Write a structure and sequence with these properties.
By secondary structure, the chain is an alpha+beta fold. The chain folds into two domains: about 230 residues, Transferase(Phosphotransferase), domain 1 (Orthogonal Bundle), CATH 1.10.510.10; about 90 residues, Phosphorylase Kinase, domain 1, CATH 3.30.200. About 35% of the residues lie in helices and about 15% in strands. The chain contains twelve helices and nine strands. It is globular and about 60 Å long. The structure holds 3-[(4-pyridin-2-yl-1,3-thiazol-2-yl)amino]benzoic acid. The site of 3-[(4-pyridin-2-yl-1,3-thiazol-2-yl)amino]benzoic acid (N4N) has 13 residues, from strand 1 and strand 3. 3-[(4-pyridin-2-yl-1,3-thiazol-2-yl)amino]benzoic acid (N4N) binds next to strand 1 and strand 3. This is Casein kinase II subunit alpha. It catalyses: L-seryl-[protein] + ATP = O-phospho-L-seryl-[protein] + ADP + H(+); L-threonyl-[protein] + ATP = O-phospho-L-threonyl-[protein] + ADP + H(+). Its EC number is 2.7.11.1. Its main location: nucleus.
């Protein structure tokens, strides 16, 4: 027999109740603006899928950010655009302002609201205990929103969480890997950065859901409170699961594989070994103890579960004691 099916615990059928055009992005028609409205100022970054620039909208003198896409299948561009338009205006979601056809590359360019970024490699070393709870709460607002809208991000990691620390503002960016959740759909497991891939991706379990983003969030939280980046530091996708298993233990891993009748890649046989579940105290030391508390460890533990069905939802996470003071201040 094959793998046991799975469905999201929450927001399971939200896309089914929408009109088909909400999620049928292959049939999305792109609304193009005027590429002459924008003059590039300077380059801000580059990646495998795009280059990102500061630009000026010369019709109103507004600063914007322009993401010029490298060649990719048009259906992937339609996907990202449709998701950005669906999520526009949601809390802490980057705002897509315009779409233009770049004259040189002949590829699309997405135009986004400007947001000032403090690079995480400089910010994360100055964050207080309170800052981490605050910004984790703000990320959870974006994840609960997009999940409630039927969308999983699938690429949650520090580079995709832009933080203007001076104004305590945060935006979840790069929706190029995001997808619509449909019950029973089997998804590509070649998503997310290595260090943030959930166990379902590493064992090739395709019927995953929003809870994938909650694993990635737990990896971010561990790296911030323990000041260890990345927290699970694998050499490849196989070794990545080994690094997880040396912390979470192999017993719950094999229980997970058994529960969903997952056929484990035979490469894993010789490398996973047998490992006890470790106590989080072993990652606490004098340089990070001010960021670690019983509340943080309880919250972290409830995110980092092999069984995607047993991880906190974004809404459950927001109600955890770790956020009581953040919640009280925001009232
Ligand atoms: O893919 C996306 O959705 C997206 C949306 C907005 C921005 C970026 N990417 C980058 N933005 C910067 C940056 C740095 C300083 C000030 C402003 N932006 C550097 S890399 C990506």
């Amino acid at each position: 027999s094959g793998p046991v099916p799975s469905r999201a615990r929450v927001y399971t059928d939200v896309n089914t109740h929408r009109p088909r055009e909400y999620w049928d992005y292959e049939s999305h028609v792109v609304e193009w603006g005027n590429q002459d409205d924008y003059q590039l100022v300077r380059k801000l970054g580059r990646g495998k899928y795009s280059e990102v620039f500061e630009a000026i909208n010369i019709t109103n003198n507004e600063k914007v950010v322009v993401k010029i896409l490298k060649p990719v299948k048009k259906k992937k561009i339609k996907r990202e655009i449709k998701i950005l338009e669906n999520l526009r205006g949601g809390p802490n979601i980057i705002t897509l302002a315009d779409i233009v056809k770049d004259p040189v590359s002949r590829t699309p360019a997405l135009v986004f609201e400007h947001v000032n970024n403090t690079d995480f490699k400089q910010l994360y070393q100055t964050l207080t205990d309170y800052d981490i709870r605050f910004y984790m709460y703000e990320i959870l607002k974006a994840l609960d929103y997009c999940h409630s809208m039927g969308i999983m991000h699938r690429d949650v990691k520090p580079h995709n969480v832009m933080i203007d620390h001076e104004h305590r503002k945060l935006r979840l960016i790069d929706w190029g890997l995001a997808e619509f959740y449909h019950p029973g759909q089997e998804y590509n497991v070649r998503v997310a950065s290595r260090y943030f891939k959930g166990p379902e991706l590493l064992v090739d379990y395709q019927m995953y859901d929003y809870s994938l983003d909650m694993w990635s969030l737990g990896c971010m939280l561990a790296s911030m409170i323990f000041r260890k980046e990345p927290f699970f530091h694998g050499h490849d996708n196989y070794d990545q699961l080994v690094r997880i298993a040396k912390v979470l233990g192999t017993e719950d891993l094999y229980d997970y594989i058994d529960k969903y009748n997952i056929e484990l890649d035979p490469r894993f046989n010789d490398i996973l070994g047998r490992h006890s579940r470790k106590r989080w105290e072993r990652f606490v030391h004098s340089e990070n103890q001010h960021l670690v508390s019983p509340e943080a460890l309880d919250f972290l533990d409830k995110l980092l579960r092999y069984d995607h069905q047993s991880r906190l939802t974004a809404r459950e996470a927001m109600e955890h004691p770790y956020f009581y003071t953040v919640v009280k201040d925001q009232a």
